[PDB]
Amino acid sequence: AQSVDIHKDQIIFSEGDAGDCAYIIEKGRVLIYLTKDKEEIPLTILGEGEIFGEMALIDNQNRSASVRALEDVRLAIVTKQQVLERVSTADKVVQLLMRVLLKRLRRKNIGQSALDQIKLENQIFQAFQNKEFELFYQPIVNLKNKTITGCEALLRWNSPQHGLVSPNLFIDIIENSSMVIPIGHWIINQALKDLRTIQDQLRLNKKERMADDFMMSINISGRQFTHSDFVNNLEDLREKHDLHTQNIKLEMTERIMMDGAIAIDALNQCRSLGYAISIDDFGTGFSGLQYLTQMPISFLKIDRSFVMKILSDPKSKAVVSSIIHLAHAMDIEVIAEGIEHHEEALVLETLGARFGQGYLFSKPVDLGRFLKLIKL
Amino acid sequence: QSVDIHKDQIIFSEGDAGDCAYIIEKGRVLIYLTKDKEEIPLTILGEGEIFGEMALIDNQNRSASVRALEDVRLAIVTKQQVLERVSTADKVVQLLMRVLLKRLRRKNIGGTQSALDQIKLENQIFQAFQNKEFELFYQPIVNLKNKTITGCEALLRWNSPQHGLVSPNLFIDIIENSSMVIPIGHWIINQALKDLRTIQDQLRLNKKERMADDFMMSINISGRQFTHSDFVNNLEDLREKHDLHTQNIKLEMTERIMMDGAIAIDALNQCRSLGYAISIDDFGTGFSGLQYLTQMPISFLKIDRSFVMKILSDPKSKAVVSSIIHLAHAMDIEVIAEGIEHHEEALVLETLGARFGQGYLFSKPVDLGRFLKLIK
Ligand SMILES: Nc1nc2c(ncn2[C@@H]2O[C@@H]3COP(=O)(O)O[C@H]4[C@@H](O)[C@H](n5cnc6c(=O)[nH]c(N)nc65)O[C@@H]4COP(=O)(O)O[C@H]3[C@H]2O)c(=O)[nH]1
Ligand SMILES: Nc1nc2c(ncn2[C@@H]2O[C@@H]3COP(=O)(O)O[C@H]4[C@@H](O)[C@H](n5cnc6c(=O)[nH]c(N)nc65)O[C@@H]4COP(=O)(O)O[C@H]3[C@H]2O)c(=O)[nH]1
Ligand SMILES: Nc1ncnc2c1ncn2[C@@H]1O[C@@H]2COP(=O)(O)O[C@H]2[C@H]1O
Ligand SMILES: Nc1ncnc2c1ncn2[C@@H]1O[C@@H]2COP(=O)(O)O[C@H]2[C@H]1O
Ligand SMILES: [Ca+2]
Ligand SMILES: [Ca+2]
Ligand SMILES: [Ca+2]
Ligand SMILES: [Ca+2]
């Protein structure tokens, strides 16, 4: 059953028959018609390239019309199994759109959790608009001397409904929605604003070197990065706040590498302009081993998930050792994440990790408390 | 946040621009056209049903007017939201939408080709399977020190009567992401196990008992066929059917299998408890494996072709290979280097610590007959 030839005047199937399979026309033409009492009623003619017999398969109902070959035709068979396989695995509302169209095309030619997702997106975007969002900052520290060298910017939603939704999942929603670009724009702006403030205070207390080497880490999502005008907008924002590129560090996940072409150059643009590129959640998600060989990275983060089990089992300790040494060999530098105890800080230090981040040192805090932290 | 509209209120009129769609929560509405003075009722829509969607998808005007027949409450659905969901839908599913839309419009008033080609190709492939056009070739895996054959990888081949001996990349993806995995996968495992028994029998009959006892048959098991239930059950009867020991059978997955997690982890442990060797193929290419080495009981891990072919070319990918090999040893995992074409690369991999090898240098994959000759 590949393609099949049928001759002129042959009824392929009749209306009211059971729906076995669909057909795509390769050669010739066919007629779609209804019959009422004695009169036959032509709905349309279908020439090559067009498809028919599909309706019956999707919703498991009978043939809504008859079909007859107006000339010699050649048809390519499409199976019931094939269409169901594709519709069943489709988006939830997309499947509704299909059912209404089917039912309307039939009815006329004769004559919650999906909704909840929509409502939640609106709740989040409305929350954004009423100024319920805020950035906190977590110190990144030099493990040797315990000195603060920078900070990661982290988003916060000040509402009791955030706990009802999920700590992570409101970011997932944001990231997969197209409210990414206006919110992302606000984040970058806010972080850059507070960076200027952090630097200004440091200089006014005769800490010129610490101010010159300070890093502001910003978490940039996949959609907002691969969007055009990203570097353009990012640059006028840096200009607006009078900042240098070496103090701004962009933090992506590995997943950004699966795209390829559209990403490569944007990484290289940021790299040529002087922005530091950091890879977060490394070894968790999309594999970058061979993509770390060719692309230009500055830092790479050993994720919480590894660090918390570093003393627990020796398997994940081996992996951390490996990551750290590999990073050095690649000329990449490392920030260990999720350090909660002095013991794990020591191990990471003897393994060769230079920089640290975790509750041991400091949980993320507001700008006020952060400015106080950098006076000791 | 839904909106109430009173009786007789026109929501929108035909010919208006398409802002957004609506889902009816309470009440009923009428869909109608107007000609000159007379209005023509297409249908009535009650609660649960959706309207105003057509205009948004293909960016055309309102195809009909809508008026509330009673007090109704409507839930708003945005333009952005529908486009976001349809654009990210399956390729043929999007065709099915366009034909239905066009037919519902064209009759109410009265990326195409490569989508169809996918359907035709699946049928071509499955039909080819059914007329016995598939065959397994085997590629020697060799001990790098002594150059002795220690096992083989089973690789699928399509020897079409018109296309000829075509190679698996053009049709394995299709097979793997289709309902035809389970019957074809079953045939592969059976065929490989059948020919394993043969390989062992011939070895013993030539007084090579030790080589027969240590022989490995590598089988490439896809993600869908692994995560399917009855996998270990079917695998086990098949081993019993051919009178084979588990230590001679090695299952070869890609990293992707563990994006699932729970459903996989135990099936790995079942195979591991039963005595099957688990090998990870295409490591560092696809879904990140670093954290997968912490969780899984792995026996072997393959350094992919992609690394090996550039191992002399640039020193960056040589560092990565060194790292992988040492990490593997530290995890108590053993290594098979893949895609060795020159003696020089074989030497480097040997000094780096890789024990086993696979590549054209030694032998390309061949039929069972030629393989049985190779092992003398
Ligand atoms: N248990 C433990 N956790 C520690 C410790 N130290 C830091 N953490 C947590 O580690 C997370 C930062 O890592 P991430 O991979 O950027 O993980 C972030 C990041 O993926 C995303 N995110 C946060 N802010 C932004 C943002 O502004 N833009 C985007 N696109 N994503 C953001 O949300 C994720 C979670 O953010 P948070 O809940 O703030 O969680 C933070 C922080 O609270 C520790 O010592 N112990
Ligand atoms: N150029 C070059 N190539 C070398 C060399 N040494 C080995 N190869 C190639 O490496 C491929 C096997 O690696 P794979 O990652 O399992 O790659 C396989 C595997 O992912 C998939 N595949 C093949 N057979 C099966 C199967 O029976 N079941 C499943 N699930 N997948 C299969 O198809 C992929 C390609 O298979 P093949 O075309 O047979 O290609 C083979 C083999 O021809 C070399 O020295 N030079
Ligand atoms: N109004 C129409 N205009 C064009 N084709 C139609 C129309 N109605 C039905 N068809 C096609 O005719 C086929 C009859 O069999 P099905 O109902 O399975 O699938 C139907 C559609 O593919
Ligand atoms: N024939 C029909 N049967 C039921 N609803 C229809 C029909 N034609 C159009 N509609 C609906 O009326 C809406 C008018 O605006 P749209 O064309 O955007 O989307 C249209 C459909 O949602
Ligand atoms: Ca981060
Ligand atoms: Ca992280
Ligand atoms: Ca393989
Ligand atoms: Ca491989």
Numbering used by the authors:
A (entry chain A): 5 to 115, 138 to 402
B (entry chain B): 6 to 115, 136 to 401
Provide the authors' own sentences about this structure as they appear in the paper.
Herein, we provide high‐resolution structures for an EAL enzyme Bd1971, from the predatory bacterium Bdellovibrio bacteriovorus, which is controlled by a second signaling nucleotide, cAMP. C‐di‐GMP turnover was increased ~8‐fold in the presence of cAMP or cGMP, further supporting the proposal that cNMPs are activators of Bd1971.
Our observation of a classical open/productive EAL dimer for Bd1971 led us to investigate competency for c‐di‐GMP binding at the active site. Clear electron density was observed for c‐di‐GMP at both dimer active sites, bound in the expected extended conformation (determined to 2.83 Å resolution, structure in Fig 3E). In comparison with our multiple structures with an empty EAL active site, there are no gross changes upon binding substrate; this is distinct from MorA, whose H‐helix (mapping to the Bd1971 interdomain linker helix) and associated GGDEF domain undergo a 20˚ rotation when c‐di‐GMP binds (Phippen et al, 2014). Smaller, local changes upon binding are limited to the metal‐binding pocket (which like other EAL domains, binds one metal in the empty state and two metals in the substrate complex), and residues which undergo rotameric changes to accommodate c‐di‐GMP (Arg330 shifts to relieve a clash with the nucleotide base and ribose, Arg182 and Tyr385 move inward to interact with base and phosphate, respectively). Structure of the cyclic‐di‐GMP bound complex of Bd1971 (ligand C represented in yellow, bound Ca2+ ions as green spheres). Residues R182, R330, and Y385 display the largest shift between the apoenzyme (tan) and bound (blue) states, R182 complexing the cyclic‐di‐GMP phosphate, and Y385 stacking with a guanine base.
